[PDB]
Design a protein around this nucleic acid. Sequence first.
RNA 1: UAUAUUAAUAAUGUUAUGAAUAAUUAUUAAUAAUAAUAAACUAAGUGAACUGAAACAUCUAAGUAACUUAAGGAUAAGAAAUCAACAGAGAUAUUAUGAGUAUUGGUGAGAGAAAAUAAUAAAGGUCUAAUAAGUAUUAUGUGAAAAAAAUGUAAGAAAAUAGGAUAACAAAUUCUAAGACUAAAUACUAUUAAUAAGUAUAGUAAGUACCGUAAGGGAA
RNA 2: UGCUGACAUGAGUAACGAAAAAAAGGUAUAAACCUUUUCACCUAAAACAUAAGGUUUAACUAUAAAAGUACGGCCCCUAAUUAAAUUAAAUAUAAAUAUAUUUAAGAUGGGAUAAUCUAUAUUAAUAUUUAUCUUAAAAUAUAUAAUUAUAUUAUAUAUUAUAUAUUUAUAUAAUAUAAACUAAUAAAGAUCAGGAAAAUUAAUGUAUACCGUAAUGUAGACCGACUCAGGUAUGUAAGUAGAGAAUAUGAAGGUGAAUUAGAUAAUUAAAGGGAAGGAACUCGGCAAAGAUAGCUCAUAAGUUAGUCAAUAAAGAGUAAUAAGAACAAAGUUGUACAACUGUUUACUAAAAACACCGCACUUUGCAGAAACGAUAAGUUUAAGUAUAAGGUGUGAACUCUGCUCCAUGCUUAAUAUAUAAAUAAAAUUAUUUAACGAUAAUUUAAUUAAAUUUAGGUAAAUAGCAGCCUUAUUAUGAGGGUUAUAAUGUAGCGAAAUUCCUUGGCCU
RNA 3: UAAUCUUAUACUUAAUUCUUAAGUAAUAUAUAAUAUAUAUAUAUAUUAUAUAUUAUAAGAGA
Lengths: 184, 46
Amino acid sequence: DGLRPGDVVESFRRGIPQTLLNEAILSVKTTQRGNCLPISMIPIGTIIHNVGITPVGPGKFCRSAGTYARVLAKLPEKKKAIVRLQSGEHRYVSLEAVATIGVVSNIDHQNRSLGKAGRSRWLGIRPTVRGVAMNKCDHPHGGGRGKSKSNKLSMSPWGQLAKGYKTRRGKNQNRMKVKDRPRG
Amino acid sequence: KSRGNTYQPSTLKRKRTFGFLARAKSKQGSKILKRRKLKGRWFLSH
RNA sequence: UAUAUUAAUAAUGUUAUGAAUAAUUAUUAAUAAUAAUAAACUAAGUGAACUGAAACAUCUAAGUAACUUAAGGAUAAGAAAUCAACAGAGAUAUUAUGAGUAUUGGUGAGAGAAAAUAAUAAAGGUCUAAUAAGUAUUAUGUGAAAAAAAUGUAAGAAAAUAGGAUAACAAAUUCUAAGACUAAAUACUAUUAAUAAGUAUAGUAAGUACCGUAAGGGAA
RNA sequence: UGCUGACAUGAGUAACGAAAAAAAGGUAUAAACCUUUUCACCUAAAACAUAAGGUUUAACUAUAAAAGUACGGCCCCUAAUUAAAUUAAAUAUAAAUAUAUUUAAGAUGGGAUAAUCUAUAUUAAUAUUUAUCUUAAAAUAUAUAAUUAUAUUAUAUAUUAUAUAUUUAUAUAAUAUAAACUAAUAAAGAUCAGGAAAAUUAAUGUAUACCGUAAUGUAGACCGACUCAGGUAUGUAAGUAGAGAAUAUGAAGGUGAAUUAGAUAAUUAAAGGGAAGGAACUCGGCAAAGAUAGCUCAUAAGUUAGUCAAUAAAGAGUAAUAAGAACAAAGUUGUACAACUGUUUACUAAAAACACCGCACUUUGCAGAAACGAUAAGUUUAAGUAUAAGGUGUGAACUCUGCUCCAUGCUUAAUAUAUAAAUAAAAUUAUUUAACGAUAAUUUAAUUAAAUUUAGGUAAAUAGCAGCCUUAUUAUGAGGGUUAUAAUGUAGCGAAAUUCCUUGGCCU
RNA sequence: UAAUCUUAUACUUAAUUCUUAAGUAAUAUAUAAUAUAUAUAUAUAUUAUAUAUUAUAAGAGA
Ligand SMILES: [Mg+2]
Ligand SMILES: [Mg+2]
Ligand SMILES: [Mg+2]
Ligand SMILES: [Mg+2]
Ligand SMILES: [Mg+2]
Ligand SMILES: [Mg+2]
Ligand SMILES: [Mg+2]
Ligand SMILES: [Mg+2]
Ligand SMILES: [Mg+2]
Ligand SMILES: [Mg+2]
Ligand SMILES: [Mg+2]
Ligand SMILES: [Mg+2]
Ligand SMILES: [Mg+2]
Ligand SMILES: [Mg+2]
Ligand SMILES: [Mg+2]
Ligand SMILES: [Mg+2]
Ligand SMILES: [Mg+2]
Ligand SMILES: [Mg+2]
Ligand SMILES: [Mg+2]
Ligand SMILES: [Mg+2]
Ligand SMILES: [Mg+2]
Ligand SMILES: [Mg+2]
Ligand SMILES: [Mg+2]
Ligand SMILES: [Mg+2]
Ligand SMILES: [Mg+2]
Ligand SMILES: [Mg+2]
Ligand SMILES: [Mg+2]
Ligand SMILES: [Mg+2]
Ligand SMILES: [Mg+2]
Ligand SMILES: [Mg+2]
Ligand SMILES: [Mg+2]
Ligand SMILES: [Mg+2]
Ligand SMILES: [Mg+2]
Ligand SMILES: [Mg+2]
Ligand SMILES: [Mg+2]
Ligand SMILES: [Mg+2]
Ligand SMILES: [Mg+2]
Ligand SMILES: [Mg+2]
Ligand SMILES: [Mg+2]
Ligand SMILES: [Mg+2]
Ligand SMILES: [Mg+2]
Ligand SMILES: [Mg+2]
Ligand SMILES: [Mg+2]
Ligand SMILES: [Mg+2]
Ligand SMILES: [Mg+2]
Ligand SMILES: [Mg+2]
Ligand SMILES: [Mg+2]
Ligand SMILES: [Mg+2]
Ligand SMILES: [Mg+2]
Ligand SMILES: [Mg+2]
Ligand SMILES: [Mg+2]
Ligand SMILES: [Mg+2]
Ligand SMILES: [Mg+2]
Ligand code: NA
């Protein structure tokens, strides 16, 4: 977020090097914004981004503009650390997984308004044709005289319900989630 | 918009699509060629 | 780059100190290469629909068309864990009778054996296996319109004192699975010969002309 | 409405495909061929160069001439993409095949040297898009070093005169139009943030391969069945004029044609003019007519503040007063619908329909959601990570968006609650057996799902928003009492693109 | 958790390379003995015996 040219950032993903070791006391020095480290080092409560899953793999979660996660708890017994992601889903992440300190840049990205259709086209976004505009053959919402919704439940062109229908369900669900994201 | 001129020649494209070697290279094209040979065709491909 | 290397010699000219280093020609020895290959017939895999049932959905069409794969001059099958019925037969293949009979079917449409007796047929019997286990059998899901032998999932035997065969059981009978080979009659193609109440619009050109981007269609 | 062939009929009818021709002569053979002269047409083309294409049509068989420099291919290199190719076991798969990775191919692109002409081999060794302003500098004139006004301002070459290497080289100075245009340079604005891939010295080389080259190419030589007013890529495109590639003309070049000659009724087409009237036409001002500068000024209400409205209407200056080329320029307003620029039925609909930017809902934590995959591996999503991506509705913004979960769904919680397959062992029964046994069914015993039900939640999910009675002198109905329901139409709007009765009543 | 699954990344003999076998050197693990330090247990060093040269790391996990 507040990073500007001239700032200095380290990374303690390998570990605390012999420079800083020779010269908590270390935690406060380390937990400056912009520098990366394992969630074990990152104190409980503080805001983070580019949160990893595994102790070896890269930062996956919380990458977009003005997004962030928050460290909620850490369990050295199970080698996990409960982290709240931007969605609000509380989630187990490996205790030795990587995460940068601070919120992501460009918080005001969301407030941009594209002026015109052409801007969307430039960005690489072709037009969405509504299901109600289509013929019945093309989309369930299609058909009817005048404009009608056909008494048809809001759903995709391939019949998957659009409003509220949980798509990841049953056995195939997320094992690592502690508390599901706030919904509606 | 007047129709009729759907053929728009370009030798290279023709040879790519309908040339002998294209037929030979594909399995389906090889089968076509064989079929034409069986029929008795003088001209198997472009 | 095979009118090639690589080496060994021989002849030629140049470099540096009789010996050494590179180039060109000519012999000798060494090193790799050329898929244009049928089609029909056979076997295997996957497998429609129109259609019929005066509708249609089981059923039918049909294991057909088609696509796919693989083999041989043919392939397949073949010397009984077969049939039969207390009498007997003796591999298989094709045809005639048996017989549109038994059998079976939304018991509709319709489908339909075998034994036995005849032909055709070739010498038609003969070991190649240390005699066969995740096999027979069972449950279950499928499976040639009758008649099974197959098969995914999983339980799973027996030694000839045994095992297979029929709703079931008892008697009897018959055969020996889980190892094998096999001409001949047959299919298709080509050739030769002979016979045509066949063809000159089924009588030789041309898969050409021409049509189509193309698969493909196709004259006189 | 049989098939094939032949031949009729309409009929010597229509038509002969945008078109400017004339004479003389080749030739006592020419409307059509060739030549000469005249006339016309195209001229940012009907010209000249080319690309692609094609029965070589060409100025032709005695035929389209390349080592390379404002020459192309071939070649090297790669993009998009392609590949019976590539890796006891790359992965997946009824077969076919498909996937991932390698390698190979693949131009529409990149590729060294060059007239003072140039040398490509072998061996060895370590670059989206747009812009060039202002300032500043010096130069030229007016006024009294400094002000005012005007052009000029990075590069492109010949001449002359100097200073150094020695008439050939290097540097310096001075001389020298305007308007376009090119390339190469420099600095730099905007978000939409801008390809890929293939070293250098030295020595030794280099006898320079193949293919393209005609003509046609806004067309009679290609794609349209035709010598078809259609379709067809690029570069030059004389001057005069102009803001210009508009428009007029046309230097040069090319062309004047498989139909001609006459006549020009009715009638049709495509044009020109029109008294008096001026929409009386008609479904409807359809069609036609209508431009008192195009430059410089000036330009309102409204408004989302955007000269949006505007190119405002009117109007002024310059020009012209009887007029006297073409081309650009064709009013003002009210309402309905849609924010807008866009898109759409190639060949009857361009719209009020689609899209849109914005708004809202929702799904998915990434070994995700979505889609595709006889079905997989896997691929897109994404080299992204919830301010992201997919799905759904609505459709910029202002003022706003009421009440309702009954139903269909979704969503959460309850052993509330049934039933499917799957199992031990053991009881009668039935069949059989001389007997045990064997074979069938049937019934018991612990451990049961999702579903369903119930109760919430969810309407910018799918959806819904009743009727009767009668009370303030008559009327109206603020009220009052009922039934029904999940709730009972709120704000607004209203004979609406929604109103049948209906040409509703009233006003303009 | 060696069920499953996901992700990432030397010499010598015998039949120039290729493979077998023997012993030796090198590394790792398991077992036994000896010595030393701390609170019957843990750590370090040395010696003997046995095994290995798809792996390691991370994650999910009956
Ligand atoms: Mg849309
Ligand atoms: Mg529609
Ligand atoms: Mg549908
Ligand atoms: Mg409606
Ligand atoms: Mg055609
Ligand atoms: Mg193509
Ligand atoms: Mg078959
Ligand atoms: Mg029928
Ligand atoms: Mg019918
Ligand atoms: Mg059948
Ligand atoms: Mg055989
Ligand atoms: Mg046996
Ligand atoms: Mg046996
Ligand atoms: Mg069975
Ligand atoms: Mg049958
Ligand atoms: Mg046997
Ligand atoms: Mg056999
Ligand atoms: Mg007739
Ligand atoms: Mg007539
Ligand atoms: Mg006439
Ligand atoms: Mg006429
Ligand atoms: Mg004459
Ligand atoms: Mg013009
Ligand atoms: Mg030309
Ligand atoms: Mg290549
Ligand atoms: Mg090119
Ligand atoms: Mg040419
Ligand atoms: Mg030329
Ligand atoms: Mg043509
Ligand atoms: Mg035509
Ligand atoms: Mg034409
Ligand atoms: Mg001009
Ligand atoms: Mg002229
Ligand atoms: Mg011309
Ligand atoms: Mg003409
Ligand atoms: Mg008049
Ligand atoms: Mg008048
Ligand atoms: Mg009238
Ligand atoms: Mg008009
Ligand atoms: Mg105003
Ligand atoms: Mg105009
Ligand atoms: Mg619109
Ligand atoms: Mg249309
Ligand atoms: Mg139209
Ligand atoms: Mg539309
Ligand atoms: Mg949008
Ligand atoms: Mg999915
Ligand atoms: Mg979204
Ligand atoms: Mg809409
Ligand atoms: Mg809005
Ligand atoms: Mg509402
Ligand atoms: Mg049960
Ligand atoms: Mg209405
Ligand atoms: Na509809």
